[PDB]
Amino acid sequence: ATAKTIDLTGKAVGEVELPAVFDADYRPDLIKKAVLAAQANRLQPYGPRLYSGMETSARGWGSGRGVSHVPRLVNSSRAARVPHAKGGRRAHPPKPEADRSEKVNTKERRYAIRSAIAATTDPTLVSLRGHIFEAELPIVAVNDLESLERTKQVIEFLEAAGLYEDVLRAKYGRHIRAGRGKLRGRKYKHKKSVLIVAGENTPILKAARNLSGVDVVTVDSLNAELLAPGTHAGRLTVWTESAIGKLEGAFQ
């Protein structure tokens, strides 16, 4: 329905009627399913080598030799080729031909996306989910927001709209990860601040890009990860008039 529109100076300069996507009921399980399916589809095959631990010609000694019945080397008494022998193969390892992609029907995936979009209207879900804000949900901005081209201007707008403390929270929450993930490329653990939505590709997708936590996307690139990080809806977001225009029958 109606929501206040705020300019880059922070003053309400209109009252636009929201489309029917924003008016839907919250369904955690559908969002869960959609996010899990997409994260499963990102994955990448792995597994050991084809003949690992088995390139050998070991034979058993049989009985009467006073020892066990495992295969041994032909010119020694060292066991080989079996899963409980040192250097032997592994029983049931991962396989590169295993297919781990998940399926979700288009109707229920769109329904979960609508449910997640309508969740950003509720102040309670956003507030308890982690963020800090002092604005009137939902936040809607005039279409000149796509014209901003320097990060300083975006920071000025965020400060004037009461959404900069979340950006600072994400900046100072960046912290080193624990475990074997540091050595493989995942050195930090990040935080999610704010999502900016624009109708069409503009310089705003390049200006509000370096700001910590902020993810900027166009209306034709919304999925369930962006709106429910970790399968929890209630992500702070900003829209524009063009983005509101794009969502008359977007996911219905």
Partner 1 sequence: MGKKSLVKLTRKTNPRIVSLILTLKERANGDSAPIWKDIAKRLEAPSRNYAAVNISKINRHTAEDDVLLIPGKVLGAGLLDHPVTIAALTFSDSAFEKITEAGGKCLSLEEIMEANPKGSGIRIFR
Partner 2 sequence: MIAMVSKQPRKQRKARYAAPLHIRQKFMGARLSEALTKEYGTRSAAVITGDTVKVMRGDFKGTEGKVQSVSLMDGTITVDGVISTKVDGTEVPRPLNPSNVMITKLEMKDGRRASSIKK
Partner RNA sequence: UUAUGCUAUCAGGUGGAUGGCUCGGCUCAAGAGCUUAUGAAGGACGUGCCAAGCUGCGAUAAGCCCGGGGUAGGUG
Partner RNA sequence: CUGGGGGGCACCAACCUCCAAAACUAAAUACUCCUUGAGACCGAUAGCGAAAUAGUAGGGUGACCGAACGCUGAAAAGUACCCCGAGAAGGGAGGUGCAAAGUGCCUGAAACCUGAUAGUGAUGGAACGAUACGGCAUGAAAGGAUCUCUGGCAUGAAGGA
Partner RNA sequence: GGUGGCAAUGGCUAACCUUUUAUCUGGGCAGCCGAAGCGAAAGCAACAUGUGCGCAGCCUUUUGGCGAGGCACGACGUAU
Query: Can you give the binding site for RNA, defined by CB under 7 A?
Result: 29-30, 37-50, 52-53, 55-58, 73-75, 80, 86-88, 90, 93-94, 96, 100, 105-111, 113, 179-185, 220-224, 250-251
Closer residue to RNA (CB): 26 or 155: 26
Interface residues with partner 1 (CB under 8 A) are: 25-29
Compute the distance between CA of residue 210 and CA of residue 154 in angstroms, rounded to an integer: 11
- 97 C-beta neighbours (distance < 10 Å), count: 6
Compute the distance between CA of residue 58 and CA of residue 76 in angstroms, rounded to an integer: 10
Q: Is 192 exposed, middle or buried (0-12, 13-18, 19+ CB in 10 A)?
A: buried
* Residue span 185-204 as binding mask against partner 2, x where in contact by CB under 8 A, dash where not: x-------------------
Compute the distance between CA of residue 115 and CA of residue 72 in angstroms, rounded to an integer: 62
Min separation Cβ 174 and partner 2, Å: 16
Strands (E), 131-231: 139-141, 175-176, 188-189, 195-198, 215-218
* Residue span 144-183 as binding mask against partner 2, x where in contact by CB under 8 A, dash where not: ---------------------------------------x
Min separation Cβ 136 and RNA, Å: 28
